mmCIF file of C-alpha atoms in Angstrom:
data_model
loop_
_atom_site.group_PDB
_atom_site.id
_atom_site.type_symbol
_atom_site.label_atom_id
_atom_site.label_comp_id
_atom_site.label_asym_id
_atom_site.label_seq_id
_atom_site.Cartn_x
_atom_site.Cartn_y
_atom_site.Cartn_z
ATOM 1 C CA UNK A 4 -14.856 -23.527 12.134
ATOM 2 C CA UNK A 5 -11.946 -24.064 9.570
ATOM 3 C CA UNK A 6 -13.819 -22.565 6.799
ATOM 4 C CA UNK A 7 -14.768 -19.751 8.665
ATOM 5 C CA UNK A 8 -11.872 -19.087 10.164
ATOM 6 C CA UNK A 9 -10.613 -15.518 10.898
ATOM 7 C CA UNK A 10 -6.751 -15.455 10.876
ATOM 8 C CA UNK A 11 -5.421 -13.442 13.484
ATOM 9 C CA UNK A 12 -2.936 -10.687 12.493
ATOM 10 C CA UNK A 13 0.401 -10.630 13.530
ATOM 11 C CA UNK A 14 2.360 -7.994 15.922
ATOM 12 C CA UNK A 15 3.354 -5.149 14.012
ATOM 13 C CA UNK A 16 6.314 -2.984 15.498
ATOM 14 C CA UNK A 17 5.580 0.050 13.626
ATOM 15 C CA UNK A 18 3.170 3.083 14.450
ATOM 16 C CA UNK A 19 1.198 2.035 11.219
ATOM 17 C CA UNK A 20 0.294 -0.018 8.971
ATOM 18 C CA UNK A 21 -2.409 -0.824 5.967
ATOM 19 C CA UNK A 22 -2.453 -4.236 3.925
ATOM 20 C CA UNK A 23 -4.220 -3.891 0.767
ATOM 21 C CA UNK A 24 -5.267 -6.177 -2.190
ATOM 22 C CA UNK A 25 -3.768 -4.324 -5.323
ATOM 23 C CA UNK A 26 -6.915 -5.587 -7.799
ATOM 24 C CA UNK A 27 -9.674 -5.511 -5.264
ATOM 25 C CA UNK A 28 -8.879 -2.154 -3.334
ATOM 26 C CA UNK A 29 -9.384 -4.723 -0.040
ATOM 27 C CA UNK A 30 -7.827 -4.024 3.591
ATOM 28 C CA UNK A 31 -7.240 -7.391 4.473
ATOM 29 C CA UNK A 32 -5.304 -5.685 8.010
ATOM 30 C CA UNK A 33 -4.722 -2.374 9.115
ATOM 31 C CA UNK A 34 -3.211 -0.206 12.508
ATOM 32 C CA UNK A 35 -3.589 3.693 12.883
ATOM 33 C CA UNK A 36 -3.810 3.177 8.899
ATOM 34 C CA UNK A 37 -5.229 7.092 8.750
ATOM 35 C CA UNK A 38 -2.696 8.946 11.786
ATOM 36 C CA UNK A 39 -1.035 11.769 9.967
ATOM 37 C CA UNK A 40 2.745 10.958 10.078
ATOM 38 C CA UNK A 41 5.736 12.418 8.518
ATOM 39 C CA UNK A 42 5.730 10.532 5.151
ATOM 40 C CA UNK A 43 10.233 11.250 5.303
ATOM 41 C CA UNK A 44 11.433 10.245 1.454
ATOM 42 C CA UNK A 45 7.944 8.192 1.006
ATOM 43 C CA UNK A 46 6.991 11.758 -0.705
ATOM 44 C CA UNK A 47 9.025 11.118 -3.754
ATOM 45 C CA UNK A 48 6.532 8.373 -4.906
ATOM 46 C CA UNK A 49 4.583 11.486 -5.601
ATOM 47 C CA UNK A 50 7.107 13.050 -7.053
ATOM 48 C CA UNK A 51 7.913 10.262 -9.242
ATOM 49 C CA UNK A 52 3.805 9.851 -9.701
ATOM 50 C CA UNK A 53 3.956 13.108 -11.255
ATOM 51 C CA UNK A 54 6.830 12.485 -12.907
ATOM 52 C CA UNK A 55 5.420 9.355 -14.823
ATOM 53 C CA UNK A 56 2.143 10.822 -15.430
ATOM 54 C CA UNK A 57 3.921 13.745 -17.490
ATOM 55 C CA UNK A 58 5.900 11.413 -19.301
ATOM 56 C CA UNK A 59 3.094 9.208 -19.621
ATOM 57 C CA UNK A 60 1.177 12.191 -21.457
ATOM 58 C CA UNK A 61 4.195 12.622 -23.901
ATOM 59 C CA UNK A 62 5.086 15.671 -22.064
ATOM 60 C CA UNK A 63 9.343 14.169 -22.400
ATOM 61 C CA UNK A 64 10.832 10.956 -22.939
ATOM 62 C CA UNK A 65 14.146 9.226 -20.799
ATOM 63 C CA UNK A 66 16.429 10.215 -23.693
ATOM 64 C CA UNK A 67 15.639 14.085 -23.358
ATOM 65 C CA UNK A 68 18.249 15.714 -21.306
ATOM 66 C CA UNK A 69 17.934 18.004 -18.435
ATOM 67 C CA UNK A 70 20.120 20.959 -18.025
ATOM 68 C CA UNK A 71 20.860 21.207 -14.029
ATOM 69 C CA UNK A 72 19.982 24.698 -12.569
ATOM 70 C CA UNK A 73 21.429 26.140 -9.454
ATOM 71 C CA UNK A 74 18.308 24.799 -7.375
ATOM 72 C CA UNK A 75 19.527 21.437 -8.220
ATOM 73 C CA UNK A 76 23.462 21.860 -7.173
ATOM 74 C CA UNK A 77 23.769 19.197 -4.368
ATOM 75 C CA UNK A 78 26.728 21.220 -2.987
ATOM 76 C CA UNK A 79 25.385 24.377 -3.559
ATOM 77 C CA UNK A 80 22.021 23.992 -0.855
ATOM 78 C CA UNK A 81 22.677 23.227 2.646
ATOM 79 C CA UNK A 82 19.097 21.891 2.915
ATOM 80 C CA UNK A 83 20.559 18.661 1.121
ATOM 81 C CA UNK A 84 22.741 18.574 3.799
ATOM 82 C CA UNK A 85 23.060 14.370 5.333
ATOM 83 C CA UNK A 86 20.309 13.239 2.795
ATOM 84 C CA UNK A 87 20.616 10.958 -0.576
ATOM 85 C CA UNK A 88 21.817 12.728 -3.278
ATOM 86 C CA UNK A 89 23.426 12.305 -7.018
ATOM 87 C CA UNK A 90 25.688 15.422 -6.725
ATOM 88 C CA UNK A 91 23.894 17.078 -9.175
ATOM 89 C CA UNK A 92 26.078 20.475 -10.734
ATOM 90 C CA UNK A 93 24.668 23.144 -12.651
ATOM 91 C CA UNK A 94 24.862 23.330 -16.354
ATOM 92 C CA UNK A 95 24.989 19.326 -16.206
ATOM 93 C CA UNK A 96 22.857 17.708 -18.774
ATOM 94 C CA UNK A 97 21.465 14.676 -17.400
ATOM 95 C CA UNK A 98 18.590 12.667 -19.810
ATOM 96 C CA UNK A 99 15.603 11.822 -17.740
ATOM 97 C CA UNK A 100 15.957 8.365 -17.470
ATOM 98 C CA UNK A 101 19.321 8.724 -15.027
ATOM 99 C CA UNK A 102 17.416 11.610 -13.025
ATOM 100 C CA UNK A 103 13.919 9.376 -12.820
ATOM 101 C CA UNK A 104 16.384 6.748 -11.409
ATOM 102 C CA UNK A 105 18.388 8.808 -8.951
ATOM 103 C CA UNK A 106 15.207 9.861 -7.777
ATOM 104 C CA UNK A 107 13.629 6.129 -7.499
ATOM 105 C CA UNK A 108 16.197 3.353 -6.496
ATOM 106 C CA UNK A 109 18.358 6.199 -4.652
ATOM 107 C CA UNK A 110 15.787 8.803 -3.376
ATOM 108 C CA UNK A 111 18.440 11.661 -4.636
ATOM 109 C CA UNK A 112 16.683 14.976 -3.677
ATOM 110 C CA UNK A 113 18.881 16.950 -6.538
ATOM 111 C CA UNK A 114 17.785 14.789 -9.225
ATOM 112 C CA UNK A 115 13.949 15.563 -7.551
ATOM 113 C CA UNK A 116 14.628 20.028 -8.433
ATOM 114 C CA UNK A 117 15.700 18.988 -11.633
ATOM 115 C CA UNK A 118 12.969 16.758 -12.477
ATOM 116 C CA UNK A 119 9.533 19.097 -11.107
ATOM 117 C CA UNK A 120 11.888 22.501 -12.987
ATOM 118 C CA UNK A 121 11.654 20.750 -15.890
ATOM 119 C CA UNK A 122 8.117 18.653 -16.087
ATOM 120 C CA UNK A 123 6.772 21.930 -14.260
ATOM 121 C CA UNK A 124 8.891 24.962 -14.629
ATOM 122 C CA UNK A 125 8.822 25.574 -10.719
ATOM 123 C CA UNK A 126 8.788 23.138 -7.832
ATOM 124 C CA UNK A 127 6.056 25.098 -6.326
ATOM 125 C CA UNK A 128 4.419 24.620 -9.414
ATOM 126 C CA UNK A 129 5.275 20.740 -9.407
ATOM 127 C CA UNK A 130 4.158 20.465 -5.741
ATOM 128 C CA UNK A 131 1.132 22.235 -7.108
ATOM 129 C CA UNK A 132 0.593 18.969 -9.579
ATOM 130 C CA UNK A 133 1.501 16.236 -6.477
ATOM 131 C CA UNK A 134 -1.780 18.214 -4.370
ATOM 132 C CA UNK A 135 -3.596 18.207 -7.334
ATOM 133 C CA UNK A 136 -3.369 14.377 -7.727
ATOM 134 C CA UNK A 137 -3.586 13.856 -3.996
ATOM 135 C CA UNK A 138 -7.266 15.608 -4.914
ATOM 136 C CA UNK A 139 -8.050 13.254 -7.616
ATOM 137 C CA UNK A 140 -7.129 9.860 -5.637
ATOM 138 C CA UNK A 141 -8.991 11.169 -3.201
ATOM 139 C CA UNK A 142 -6.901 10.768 -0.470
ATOM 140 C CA UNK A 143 -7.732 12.544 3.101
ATOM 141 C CA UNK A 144 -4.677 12.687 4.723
ATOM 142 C CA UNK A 145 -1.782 14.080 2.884
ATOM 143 C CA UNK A 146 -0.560 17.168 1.633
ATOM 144 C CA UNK A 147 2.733 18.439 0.129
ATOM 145 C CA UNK A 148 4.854 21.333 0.383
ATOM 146 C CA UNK A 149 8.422 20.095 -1.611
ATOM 147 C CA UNK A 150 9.268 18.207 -4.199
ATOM 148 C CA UNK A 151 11.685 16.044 -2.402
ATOM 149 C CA UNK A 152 10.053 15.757 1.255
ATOM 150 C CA UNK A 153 12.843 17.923 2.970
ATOM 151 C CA UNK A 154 12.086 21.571 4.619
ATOM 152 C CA UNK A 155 8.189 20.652 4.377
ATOM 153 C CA UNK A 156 6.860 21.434 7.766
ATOM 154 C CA UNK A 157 3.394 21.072 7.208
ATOM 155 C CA UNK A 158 3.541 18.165 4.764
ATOM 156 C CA UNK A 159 1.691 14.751 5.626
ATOM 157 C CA UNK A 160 0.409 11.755 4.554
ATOM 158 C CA UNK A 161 -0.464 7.871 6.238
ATOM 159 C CA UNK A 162 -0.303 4.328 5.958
ATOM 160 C CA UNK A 163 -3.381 4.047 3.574
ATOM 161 C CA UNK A 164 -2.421 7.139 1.094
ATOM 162 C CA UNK A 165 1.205 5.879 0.741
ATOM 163 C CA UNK A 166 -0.403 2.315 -0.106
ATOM 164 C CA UNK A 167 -3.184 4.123 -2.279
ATOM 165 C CA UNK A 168 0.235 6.187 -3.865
ATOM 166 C CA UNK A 169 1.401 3.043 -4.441
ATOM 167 C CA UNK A 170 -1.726 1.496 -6.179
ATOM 168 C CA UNK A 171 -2.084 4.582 -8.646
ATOM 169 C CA UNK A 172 1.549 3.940 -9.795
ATOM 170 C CA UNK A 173 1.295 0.549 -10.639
ATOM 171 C CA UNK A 174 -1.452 1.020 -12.355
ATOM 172 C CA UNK A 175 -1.696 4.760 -13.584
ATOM 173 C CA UNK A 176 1.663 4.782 -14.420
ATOM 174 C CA UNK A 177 2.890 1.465 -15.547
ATOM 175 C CA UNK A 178 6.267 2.152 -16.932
ATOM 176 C CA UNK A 179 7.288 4.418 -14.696
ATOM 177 C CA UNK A 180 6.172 1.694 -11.682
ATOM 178 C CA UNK A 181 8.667 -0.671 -13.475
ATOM 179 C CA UNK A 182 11.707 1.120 -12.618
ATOM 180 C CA UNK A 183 11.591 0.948 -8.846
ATOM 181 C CA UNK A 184 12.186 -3.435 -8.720
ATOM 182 C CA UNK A 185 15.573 -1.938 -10.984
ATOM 183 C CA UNK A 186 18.294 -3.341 -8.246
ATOM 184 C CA UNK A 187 20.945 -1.057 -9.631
ATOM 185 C CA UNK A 188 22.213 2.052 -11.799
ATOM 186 C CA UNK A 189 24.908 4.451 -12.876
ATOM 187 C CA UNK A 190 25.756 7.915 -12.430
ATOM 188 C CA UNK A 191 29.033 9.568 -12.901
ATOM 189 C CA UNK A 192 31.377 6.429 -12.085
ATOM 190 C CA UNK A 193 29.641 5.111 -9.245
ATOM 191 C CA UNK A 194 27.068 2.334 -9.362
ATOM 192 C CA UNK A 195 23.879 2.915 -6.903
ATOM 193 C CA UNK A 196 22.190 0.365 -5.038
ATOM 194 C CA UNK A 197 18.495 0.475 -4.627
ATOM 195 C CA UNK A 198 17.425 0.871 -0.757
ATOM 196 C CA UNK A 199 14.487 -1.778 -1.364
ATOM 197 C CA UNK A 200 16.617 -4.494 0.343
ATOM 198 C CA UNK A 201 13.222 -6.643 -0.046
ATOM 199 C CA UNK A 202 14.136 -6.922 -3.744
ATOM 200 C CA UNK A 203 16.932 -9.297 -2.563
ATOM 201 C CA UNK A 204 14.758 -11.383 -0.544
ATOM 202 C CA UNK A 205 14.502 -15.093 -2.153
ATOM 203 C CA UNK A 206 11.262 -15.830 -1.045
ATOM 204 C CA UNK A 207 9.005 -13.379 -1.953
ATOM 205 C CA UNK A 208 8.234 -11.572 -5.403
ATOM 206 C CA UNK A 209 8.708 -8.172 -4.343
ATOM 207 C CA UNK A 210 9.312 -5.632 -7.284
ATOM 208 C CA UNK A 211 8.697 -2.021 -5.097
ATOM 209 C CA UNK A 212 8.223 0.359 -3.926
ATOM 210 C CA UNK A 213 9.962 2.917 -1.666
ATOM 211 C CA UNK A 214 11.535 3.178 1.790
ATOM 212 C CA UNK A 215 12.174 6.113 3.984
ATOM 213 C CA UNK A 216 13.514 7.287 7.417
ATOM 214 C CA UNK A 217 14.165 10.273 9.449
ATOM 215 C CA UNK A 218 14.438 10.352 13.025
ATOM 216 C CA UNK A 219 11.100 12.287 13.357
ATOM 217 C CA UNK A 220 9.344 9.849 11.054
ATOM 218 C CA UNK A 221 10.779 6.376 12.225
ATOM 219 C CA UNK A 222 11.472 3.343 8.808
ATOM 220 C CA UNK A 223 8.991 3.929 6.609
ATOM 221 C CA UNK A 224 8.586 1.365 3.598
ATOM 222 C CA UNK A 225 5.502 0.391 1.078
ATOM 223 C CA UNK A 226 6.667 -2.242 -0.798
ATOM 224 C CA UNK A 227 4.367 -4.690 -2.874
ATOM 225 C CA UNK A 228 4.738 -8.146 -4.024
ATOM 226 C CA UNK A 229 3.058 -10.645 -6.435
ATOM 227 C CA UNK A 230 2.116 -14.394 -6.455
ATOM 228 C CA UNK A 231 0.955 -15.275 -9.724
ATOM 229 C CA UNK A 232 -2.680 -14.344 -9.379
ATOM 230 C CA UNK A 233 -2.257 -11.843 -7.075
ATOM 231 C CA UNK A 234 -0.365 -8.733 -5.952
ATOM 232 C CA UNK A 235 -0.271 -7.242 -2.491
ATOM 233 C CA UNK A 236 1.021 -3.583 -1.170
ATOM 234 C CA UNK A 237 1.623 -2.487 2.327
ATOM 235 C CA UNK A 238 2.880 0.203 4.100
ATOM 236 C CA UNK A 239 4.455 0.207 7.292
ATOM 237 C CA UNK A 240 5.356 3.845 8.997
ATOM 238 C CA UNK A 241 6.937 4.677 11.923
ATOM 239 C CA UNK A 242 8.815 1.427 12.109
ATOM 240 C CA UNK A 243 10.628 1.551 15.155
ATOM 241 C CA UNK A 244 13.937 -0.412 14.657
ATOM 242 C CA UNK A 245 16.359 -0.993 11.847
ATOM 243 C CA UNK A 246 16.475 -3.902 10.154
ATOM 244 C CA UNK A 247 13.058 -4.725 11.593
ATOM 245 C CA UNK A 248 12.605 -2.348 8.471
ATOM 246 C CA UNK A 249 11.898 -4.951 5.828
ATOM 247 C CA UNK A 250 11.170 -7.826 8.214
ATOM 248 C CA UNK A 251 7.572 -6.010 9.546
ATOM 249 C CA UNK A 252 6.574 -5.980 6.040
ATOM 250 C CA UNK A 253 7.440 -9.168 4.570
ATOM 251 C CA UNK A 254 5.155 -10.719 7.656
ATOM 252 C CA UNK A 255 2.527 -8.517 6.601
ATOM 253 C CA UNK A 256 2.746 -9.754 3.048
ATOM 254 C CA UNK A 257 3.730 -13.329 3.362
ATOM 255 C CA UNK A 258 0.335 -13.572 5.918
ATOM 256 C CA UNK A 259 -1.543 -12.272 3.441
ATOM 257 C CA UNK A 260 -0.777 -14.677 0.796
ATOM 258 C CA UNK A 261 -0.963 -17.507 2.794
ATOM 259 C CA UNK A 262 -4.400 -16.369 4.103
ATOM 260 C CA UNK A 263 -5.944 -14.373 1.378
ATOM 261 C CA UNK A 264 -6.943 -15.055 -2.657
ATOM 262 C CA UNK A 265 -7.712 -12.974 -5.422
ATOM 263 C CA UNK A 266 -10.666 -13.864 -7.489
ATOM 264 C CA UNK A 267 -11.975 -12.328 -10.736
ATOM 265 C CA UNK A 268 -15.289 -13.901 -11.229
ATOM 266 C CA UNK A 269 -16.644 -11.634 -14.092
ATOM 267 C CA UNK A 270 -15.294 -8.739 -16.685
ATOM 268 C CA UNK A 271 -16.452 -6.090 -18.032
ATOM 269 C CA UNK A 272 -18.881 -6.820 -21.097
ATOM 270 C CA UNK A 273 -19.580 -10.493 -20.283
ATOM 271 C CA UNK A 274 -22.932 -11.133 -19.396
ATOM 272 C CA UNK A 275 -23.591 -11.794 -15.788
ATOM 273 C CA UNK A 276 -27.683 -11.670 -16.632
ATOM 274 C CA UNK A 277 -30.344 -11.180 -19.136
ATOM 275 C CA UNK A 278 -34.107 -8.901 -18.519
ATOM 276 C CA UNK A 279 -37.019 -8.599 -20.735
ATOM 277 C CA UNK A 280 -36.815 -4.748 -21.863
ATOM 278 C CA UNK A 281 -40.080 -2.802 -22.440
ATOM 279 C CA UNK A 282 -40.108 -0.434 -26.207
ATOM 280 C CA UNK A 283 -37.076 -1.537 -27.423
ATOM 281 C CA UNK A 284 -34.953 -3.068 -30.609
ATOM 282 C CA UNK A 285 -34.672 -6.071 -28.479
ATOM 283 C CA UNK A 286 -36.463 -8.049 -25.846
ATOM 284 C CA UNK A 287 -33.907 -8.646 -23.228
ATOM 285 C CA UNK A 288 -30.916 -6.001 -21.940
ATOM 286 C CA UNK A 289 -27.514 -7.880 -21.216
ATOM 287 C CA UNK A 290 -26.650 -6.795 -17.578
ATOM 288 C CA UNK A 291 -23.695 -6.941 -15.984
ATOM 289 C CA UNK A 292 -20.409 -4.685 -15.125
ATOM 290 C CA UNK A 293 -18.984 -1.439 -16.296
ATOM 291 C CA UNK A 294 -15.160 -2.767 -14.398
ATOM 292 C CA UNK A 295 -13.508 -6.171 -13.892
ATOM 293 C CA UNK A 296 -14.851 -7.285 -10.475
ATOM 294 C CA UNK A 297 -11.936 -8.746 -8.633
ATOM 295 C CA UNK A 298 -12.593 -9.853 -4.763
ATOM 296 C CA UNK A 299 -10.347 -10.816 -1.682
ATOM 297 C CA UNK A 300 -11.743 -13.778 -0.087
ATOM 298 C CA UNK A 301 -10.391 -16.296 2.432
ATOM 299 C CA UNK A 302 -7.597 -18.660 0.528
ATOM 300 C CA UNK A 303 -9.304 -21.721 -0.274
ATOM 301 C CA UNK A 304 -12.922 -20.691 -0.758
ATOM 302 C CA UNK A 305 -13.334 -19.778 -4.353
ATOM 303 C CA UNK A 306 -15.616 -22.635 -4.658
ATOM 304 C CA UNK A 307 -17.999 -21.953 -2.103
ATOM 305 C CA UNK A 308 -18.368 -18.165 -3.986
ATOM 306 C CA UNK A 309 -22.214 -17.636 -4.928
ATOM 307 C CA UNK A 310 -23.235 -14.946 -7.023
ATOM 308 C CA UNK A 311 -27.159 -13.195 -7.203
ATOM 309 C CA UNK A 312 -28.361 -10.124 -8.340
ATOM 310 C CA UNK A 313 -31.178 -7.912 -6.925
ATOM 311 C CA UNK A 314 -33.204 -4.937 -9.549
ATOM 312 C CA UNK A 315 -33.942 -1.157 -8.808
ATOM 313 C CA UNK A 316 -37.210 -1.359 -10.285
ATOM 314 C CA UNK A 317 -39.667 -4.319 -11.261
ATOM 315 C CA UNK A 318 -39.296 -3.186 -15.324
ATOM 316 C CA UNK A 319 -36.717 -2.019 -17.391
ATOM 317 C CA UNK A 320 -37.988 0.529 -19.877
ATOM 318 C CA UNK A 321 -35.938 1.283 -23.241
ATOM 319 C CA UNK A 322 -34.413 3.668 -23.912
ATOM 320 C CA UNK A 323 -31.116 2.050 -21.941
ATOM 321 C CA UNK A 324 -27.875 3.726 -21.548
ATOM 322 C CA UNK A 325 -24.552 1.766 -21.955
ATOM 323 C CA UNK A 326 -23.431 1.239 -18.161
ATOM 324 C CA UNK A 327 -26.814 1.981 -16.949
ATOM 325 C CA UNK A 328 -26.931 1.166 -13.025
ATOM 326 C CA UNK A 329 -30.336 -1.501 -12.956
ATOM 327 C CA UNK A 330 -29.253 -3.096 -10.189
ATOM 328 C CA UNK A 331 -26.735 -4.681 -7.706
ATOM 329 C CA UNK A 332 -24.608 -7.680 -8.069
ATOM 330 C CA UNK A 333 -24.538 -9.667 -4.670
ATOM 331 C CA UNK A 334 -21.286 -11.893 -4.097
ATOM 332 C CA UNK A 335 -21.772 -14.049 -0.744
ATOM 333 C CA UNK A 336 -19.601 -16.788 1.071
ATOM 334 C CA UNK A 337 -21.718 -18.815 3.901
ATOM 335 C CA UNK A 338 -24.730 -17.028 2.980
ATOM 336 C CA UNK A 339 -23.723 -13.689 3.802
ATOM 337 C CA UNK A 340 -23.159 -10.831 1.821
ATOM 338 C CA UNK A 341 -18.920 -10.392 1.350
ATOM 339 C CA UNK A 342 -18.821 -7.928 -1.499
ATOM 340 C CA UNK A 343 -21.754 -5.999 -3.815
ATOM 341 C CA UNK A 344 -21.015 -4.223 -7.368
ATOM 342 C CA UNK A 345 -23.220 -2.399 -9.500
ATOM 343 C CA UNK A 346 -25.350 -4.035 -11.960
ATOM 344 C CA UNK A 347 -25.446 -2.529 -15.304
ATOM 345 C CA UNK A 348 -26.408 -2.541 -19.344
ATOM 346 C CA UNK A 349 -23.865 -3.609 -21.051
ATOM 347 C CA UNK A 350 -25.021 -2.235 -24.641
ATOM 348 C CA UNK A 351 -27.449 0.103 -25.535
ATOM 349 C CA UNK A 352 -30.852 -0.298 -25.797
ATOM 350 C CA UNK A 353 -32.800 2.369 -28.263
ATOM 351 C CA UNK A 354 -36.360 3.043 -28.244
ATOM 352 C CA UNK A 355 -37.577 0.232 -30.881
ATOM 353 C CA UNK A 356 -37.631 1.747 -34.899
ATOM 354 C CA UNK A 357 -40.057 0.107 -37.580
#
């Protein structure tokens, strides 16, 4: 009964949230995870997604400096009006890597014109980009309509996009990622503290991502932490009190650890298998998989993992395709099924030459 053990999941005083595994793309707990809310300043990790996927692509580097447009004058757009800016002037010049900061540790909506003008020449154009990759990561819940989140109506997204969001920048966009666990930076004279008040928290290895809150939307935050072996993102929306901010999600993630393990039982290229092959340049095919298989599985239990395989047809026949699907890995825990990945070739297999 230990073994098997489901944990329960704590009370969660917010209107949503997802827990994911990072590696494994796992839910390990989840509430109204798919409700359309108001995302508030959780839309600048698009923004910044964008952002890091231009740079990313050579596109500009932190050291190139962006001339400030009248879009981008804090003072000079009452629809900045109450919300986190730099104080942004025209005809400033600004290198990226003080705007890309403004617009991650501080949320500054300015610094978020400047940015999507100059990585896309329009922020309808930009916001174009930030749907675009909302198509790609396949999310079903979000859209866009500004580059910063304010006067946007009609824009959405949920507790499992902003944690998806999340994923793609820690992995898509790497460097870009490593900015937000920054605790600190200068513009103009003033130092800026980062609003991730979870960075400051002792216990827990948390190195992102973003926080938000209007009185529409509630405390929003995603944040995502690591422990060794393991990293784990979650997002809680609509959280209902302050304070109660950070503290819903580090029981979300500190529950998580102490419940949950990350395994990686077998990489890409290493051979999981081996099948005779019919008119080939060899008698067996090396099977196994085309991606690193990593699993969530109760803490504790790695041991007890068992690993089969079952075939798509009784005979392989040559020629084989690199990444050919033959088959289906089977990963079980108590003799039941937890987790299945495709079985496949790992190297070509020719029709046999003499």
């Amino acid at each position: 009964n230990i073994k098997t053990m489901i944990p329960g999941v704590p009370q969660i005083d917010a209107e949503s949230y997802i827990l994911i595994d990072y590696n494994s793309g796992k839910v390990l707990a989840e509430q109204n995870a798919d409700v359309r809310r108001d995302p508030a300043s959780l839309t600048k990790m698009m923004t910044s997604y964008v952002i890091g996927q231009a740079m990313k692509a050579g596109k500009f580097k932190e050291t190139d400096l962006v001339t400030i447009g009248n879009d981008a004058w804090a003072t000079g757009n009452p629809v900045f009006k109450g919300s986190s800016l730099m104080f942004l002037k025209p005809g400033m010049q600004v290198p990226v890597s003080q705007l890309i900061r403004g617009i991650n540790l501080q949320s500054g909506n300015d610094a978020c014109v400047a940015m999507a003008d100059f990585a896309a020449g329009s922020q309808d154009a930009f916001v174009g980009l930030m749907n675009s990759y909302v198509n790609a990561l396949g999310l079903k819940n979000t859209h866009f309509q500004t580059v910063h989140g304010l006067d946007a109506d009609g824009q959405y997204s949920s507790a499992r996009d902003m944690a998806l969001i999340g994923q793609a920048l820690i992995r898509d966009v790497p460097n870009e990622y490593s900015i937000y666990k920054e605790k600190e930076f200068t513009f103009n004279g003033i130092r800026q503290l980062n609003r991730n008040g979870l960075l400051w928290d002792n216990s827990l290895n948390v190195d992102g991502i973003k926080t938000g809150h209007t009185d529409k939307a509630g405390y929003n935050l995603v944040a995502s932490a690591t422990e060794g072996q393991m990293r784990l993102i979650s997002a809680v929306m609509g959280g209902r009190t302050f304070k109660g901010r950070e503290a819903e999600s580090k029981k979300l993630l500190t529950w998580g650890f102490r419940f949950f393990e990350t395994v990686n039982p077998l990489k890409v290229g290493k051979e999981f298998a081996s099948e005779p092959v019919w008119f080939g340049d060899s008698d067996r095919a090396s099977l196994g998989v085309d991606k690193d298989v990593y699993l969530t599985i109760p803490r504790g239990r790695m041991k007890d993992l068992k690993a089969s395989y079952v075939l798509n047809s009784s005979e392989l026949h040559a020629p084989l395709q690199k990444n050919q699907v033959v088959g289906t890995i089977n990963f079980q825990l108590d003799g039941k099924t937890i987790e299945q990945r495709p079985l496949v070739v790992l190297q070509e297999i020719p029709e046999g030459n003499f």
